[PDB]
């Protein structure tokens, strides 16, 4: 359902949506599909078919995505008229935006039933893999699936986030939005109404949202970083009862899938944020050009 859909324009000519509870739902079974095959070395040979099934699923889900493409291209088209209002009083094509934006969310909820069929196929596949899990005695279950899988598929993702300063990344994006406001203040003052002073206001505000979506996803990134790093130490280098092992691997597939969601989206949002920052620079220069001319 809506309120949980993210818009992404990493490129100038690119726009894609993402249903956050779907990417997390799919990522969750992506983990316990792997955790349930690396548990005992007798079963690693299944990765080829597991990778193969995730590909089949990611294709069926994106066939459903490509149905709304027609409405997508309308909005990509609407934006470009606002981006560079070259060849065009303003709220005329500006309102055409909000309605085509909302016609596409309406389009997704149309196939919301079609997305669930692809989702449960990931759960049904994930389940029949994790249920077949067995130990030699059920009293001493080995944390070898958990150990390998984290070190390989997850550890890298954690390491990268530790290296960067996701708080200076935010603190820098803010300085960009604040100086744009100060200069757009000086420009709307110096000349008054002009269609491009309204495109600067549009993008500036549009970028203010992408920042708030970034500020929020890095907060989940910060929390799931300490938790996954803390929790992991208690689920490896030991043996559990089988009913406790299955429990601990689900708690993991949860921390993972929620961390992976907020990391994957934060990158595309940073991508979109700085993609809109470029457009905002072109306009800014064109205005400075227009202004000095009058003098």
């Amino acid at each position, epitope marked *: 359902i809506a309120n949980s859909i993210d818009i992404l324009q990493e490129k100038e000519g690119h726009l894609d949506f993402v249903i956050i509870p779907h990417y997390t739902f799919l990522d969750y079974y992506k983990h316990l599909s792997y955790n349930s095959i690396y548990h005992k070395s007798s079963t690693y040979g299944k990765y080829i078919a597991v990778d193969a099934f995730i590909k089949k699923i990611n294709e069926a889900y994106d066939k459903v995505k490509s149905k709304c493409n027609d409405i997508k291209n309308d909005l990509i088209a609407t934006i470009k008229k606002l981006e560079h209002p070259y060849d065009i009083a303003f709220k005329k094509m500006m309102d055409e935006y909000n309605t085509k934006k909302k016609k596409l969310i309406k389009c997704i909820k149309n196939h919301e039933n079609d997305f669930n069929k692809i989702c449960m196929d990931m759960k049904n596949y994930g389940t029949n893999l994790f249920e077949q899990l067995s130990c030699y005695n059920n*009293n*001493f279950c080995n944390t070898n699936g958990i150990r390998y899988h984290y070190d390989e598929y997850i550890h890298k993702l954690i390491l990268s986030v530790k290296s960067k300063n996701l708080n200076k990344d935010l603190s820098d994006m803010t300085n960009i939005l604040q100086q744009s406001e100060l200069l757009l203040t000086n420009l709307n003052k110096k000349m008054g109404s002009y269609i491009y002073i309204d495109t600067i206001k549009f993008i500036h505000k549009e970028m203010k949202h992408i920042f708030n979506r970034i500020e929020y996803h890095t907060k989940i990134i910060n929390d799931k970083t300490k*938790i996954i790093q*803390d*929790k992991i130490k*208690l689920n490896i280098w*030991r*043996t*559990f*009862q089988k*009913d*406790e092992l299955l*429990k601990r691997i689900l*708690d993991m597939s949860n921390e993972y899938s929620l961390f992976i969601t907020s990391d994957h989206l934060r990158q595309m949002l940073y991508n979109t944020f700085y993609s809109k920052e470029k457009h905002l620079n072109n306009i800014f220069h064109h205005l400075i050009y227009v202004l000095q001319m009058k003098f």
Partner: single-chain antibody, 229 residues
Framework: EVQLVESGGGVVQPGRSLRLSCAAS????????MHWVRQAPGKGLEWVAL????????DYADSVKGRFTISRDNSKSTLSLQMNSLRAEDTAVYYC???????????????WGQGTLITVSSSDIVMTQSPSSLSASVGDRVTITCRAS??????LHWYQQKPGKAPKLLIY???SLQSGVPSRFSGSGSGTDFTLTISSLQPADFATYYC?????????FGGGTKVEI
């Protein structure tokens, strides 16, 4: 400072219901798993139920299954136990204790509440504590033994239940001294056999003493070791 004040206890006609609650103060409640452990009259420590820090997972003792229900409200910092279908076996002092380890409440119990009394008006690992009763004089090196029915690797913790007061943790990993516990107390062991060593018994009469495994699902306790001076 920490505090787990419990409430909700009293006399109950057999077969009815009663709700028990716990008031958490002094720590990040949201990060800790909680446990309810009872002590029937004169008998030892029987674990009732546990819940994870996020309240997602929660497990019970075999006897109370289908009757009791644990829950927590992280905002108010509240833990509760809804006891239904009360049998005469549920007569006990009910302790609300905090798990040592975050999220899972594994590896023992940091702090304990005083406990609230319930009076009804009518597989799992087995710990075998060696000396049931023991009478020494001041200064004696004292030793108690705990035998586990299954190899539990260093997941052994020792507790000190003074006369009519909430248990207190002394050793967490098989040999790990809790800060504030004097030098004297020491533990050792692995797999199946573990032992606690009170060198130089000090005058604080140490009352009864219980061990606890935390490797498998129901964290089993041994019977006690009453220590007289």
């Amino acid at each position: 400072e920490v505090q787990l004040v419990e409430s909700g206890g009293g006399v109950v006609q057999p077969g009815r219901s009663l709700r028990l609650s716990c008031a958490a103060s002094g720590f990040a409640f949201s990060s800790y798993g909680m446990h309810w452990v009872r002590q029937a009259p004169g008998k030892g420590l029987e674990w009732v139920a546990l819940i994870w820090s996020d309240g997602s997972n929660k497990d019970y003792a075999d006897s109370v299954k289908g009757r009791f229900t644990i829950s927590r409200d992280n905002s108010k910092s509240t833990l509760s136990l809804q006891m239904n279908s009360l049998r005469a076996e549920d007569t006990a002092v009910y302790y609300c204790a905090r798990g040592k380890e975050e999220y899972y409440g594994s590896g023992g119990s940091d702090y304990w509440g005083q406990g609230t009394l319930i009076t009804v008006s009518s597989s799992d690992i087995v710990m075998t504590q060696s000396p049931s009763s023991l009478s020494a004089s001041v200064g004696d090196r004292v030793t108690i033994t705990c035998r586990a029915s299954q190899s539990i690797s260093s997941y052994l913790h020792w507790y000190q239940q003074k006369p009519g007061k909430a248990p207190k943790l002394l050793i967490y990993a098989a040999s790990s001294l809790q800060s504030g516990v004097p030098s004297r107390f020491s533990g050792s062991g692995s797999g199946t056999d573990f032992t606690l060593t009170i060198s130089s018994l000090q005058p604080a009469d140490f009352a009864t003493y219980y061990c606890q495994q935390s490797y498998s699902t129901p964290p089993t306790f041994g019977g006690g070791t009453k220590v007289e001076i």
